[PDB]
Scaffold this active site. Structure first.
Site, PDB file in Angstrom:
ATOM      1  N   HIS A   8      -5.789   6.845  -2.657  1.00 28.74           N
ATOM      2  CA  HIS A   8      -6.677   5.833  -2.102  1.00 28.74           C
ATOM      3  C   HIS A   8      -7.811   5.429  -3.029  1.00 28.74           C
ATOM      4  O   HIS A   8      -8.260   6.203  -3.867  1.00 28.74           O
ATOM      5  CB  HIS A   8      -7.218   6.283  -0.750  1.00 28.74           C
ATOM      6  N   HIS A  33       1.555   4.489  -2.902  1.00 27.37           N
ATOM      7  CA  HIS A  33       1.655   5.946  -2.732  1.00 27.37           C
ATOM      8  C   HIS A  33       2.991   6.485  -3.249  1.00 27.37           C
ATOM      9  O   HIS A  33       3.023   7.512  -3.917  1.00 27.37           O
ATOM     10  CB  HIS A  33       1.537   6.369  -1.267  1.00 27.37           C
ATOM     11  N   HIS A  77       0.817  -1.200   0.000  1.00 28.36           N
ATOM     12  CA  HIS A  77       0.000   0.000   0.000  1.00 28.36           C
ATOM     13  C   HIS A  77       0.864   1.269   0.000  1.00 28.36           C
ATOM     14  O   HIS A  77       0.662   2.159  -0.831  1.00 28.36           O
ATOM     15  CB  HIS A  77      -0.946  -0.066   1.204  1.00 28.36           C
ATOM     16  N   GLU A  78       1.852   1.341   0.891  1.00 28.49           N
ATOM     17  CA  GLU A  78       2.717   2.525   0.954  1.00 28.49           C
ATOM     18  C   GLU A  78       3.490   2.767  -0.334  1.00 28.49           C
ATOM     19  O   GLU A  78       3.576   3.898  -0.798  1.00 28.49           O
ATOM     20  CB  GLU A  78       3.674   2.465   2.148  1.00 28.49           C
TER      21      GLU A  78
HETATM   22  O1  LIG Z   1      -0.864   5.233   3.594  1.00 25.71           O
HETATM   23  N1  LIG Z   1      -1.277   5.505   4.893  1.00 25.71           N
HETATM   24  C1  LIG Z   1      -2.581   5.582   5.125  1.00 25.71           C
HETATM   25  O2  LIG Z   1      -3.410   5.434   4.233  1.00 25.71           O
HETATM   26  C2  LIG Z   1      -2.992   5.877   6.547  1.00 25.71           C
HETATM   27  N2  LIG Z   1      -3.850   4.825   7.049  1.00 25.71           N
HETATM   28  S1  LIG Z   1      -3.243   3.464   7.636  1.00 25.71           S
HETATM   29  O3  LIG Z   1      -1.952   3.730   8.219  1.00 25.71           O
HETATM   30  O4  LIG Z   1      -4.179   2.952   8.596  1.00 25.71           O
HETATM   31  C3  LIG Z   1      -3.059   2.383   6.460  1.00 25.71           C
HETATM   32  C4  LIG Z   1      -1.784   1.991   6.035  1.00 25.71           C
HETATM   33  C5  LIG Z   1      -1.629   1.039   5.029  1.00 25.71           C
HETATM   34  C6  LIG Z   1      -2.752   0.468   4.431  1.00 25.71           C
HETATM   35  C7  LIG Z   1      -4.029   0.853   4.839  1.00 25.71           C
HETATM   36  C8  LIG Z   1      -4.177   1.804   5.853  1.00 25.71           C
HETATM   37 ZN   LIG Z   2      -2.659   5.130   2.374  1.00 18.96          ZN
END
Ligand SMILES: O=NC(=O)CNS(=O)(=O)c1ccccc1
Ligand SMILES: [Zn+2]
Ligand SMILES: [Ca+2]
Ligand SMILES: [Ca+2]
Ligand SMILES: [Ca+2]
Ligand SMILES: [Zn+2]
Length: 158
Positions: free
Chosen positions: A123, A117, A113-114
């Site tokens: 998102h 980004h 996920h990071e």
């Molecule tokens: O990228 N960071 C976020 O979206 C913040 N939310 S989180 O840290 O709870 C998170 C992190 C990674 C995946 C889903 C949610």
């Molecule tokens: Zn995120």
């Protein structure tokens, strides 16, 4: 929005969480990059010294950016979109307990996920997407990007 305008991307692990074996941190991060290189023309190399495109950091509380962490729970990690300096960097909250499995918070899944980004993704509103704003453990051994994730990344690269 910003994207990397080159195919060879470097990353560096700034420091290692004491929550995990060193080799397991390396492998989780490597596998997370591989998820994205699988569906783009991007190639990722870990470097041990110098300035990397993507710096991976474990830190807690205030750590020099404007996205202070919040202790255990809540925000797990955050990352910056492509750009110079802090652009691309991915920060993981050391107040979480990082693991290779379903206990604590799974580093690999969070890192997928990071890095999304770090590559320029935002998102998704789709609960099935890795880019959905809510962390949920799924079996990491059979993990796959959703159609939405693939559409998202291939709108930016390849
Ligand atoms: O990228 N960071 C976020 O979206 C913040 N939310 S989180 O840290 O709870 C998170 C992190 C990674 C995946 C889903 C949610
Ligand atoms: Zn995120
Ligand atoms: Ca937190
Ligand atoms: Ca950077
Ligand atoms: Ca920790
Ligand atoms: Zn940060």
């Amino acid at each position: 929005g910003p994207v990397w305008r080159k195919h060879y991307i470097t990353y560096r692990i700034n420091n290692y969480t004491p929550d995990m074996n060193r080799e397991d941190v390396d492998y989780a991060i490597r596998k997370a990059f591989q998820v994205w290189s699988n569906v783009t023309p991007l190639k990722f190399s870990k470097i041990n010294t110098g300035m990397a495109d993507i710096l991976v950091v474990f830190a807690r509380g205030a750590h020099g950016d404007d996205h202070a962490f919040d202790g255990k729970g809540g925000i797990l990690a955050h990352a910056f979109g492509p750009g110079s300096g802090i652009g691309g960097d991915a920060h993981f909250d050391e107040d979480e307990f990082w693991t290779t499995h379903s206990g604590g918070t799974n580093l690999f899944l969070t890192a997928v996920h990071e890095i999304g980004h770090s590559l320029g993704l935002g998102h998704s509103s789709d609960p099935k997407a890795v880019m959905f704003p809510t962390y949920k453990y799924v079996d990491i051994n059979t993990f796959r990007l959703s159609a939405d994730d693939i559409r998202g990344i291939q709108s930016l690269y390849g």
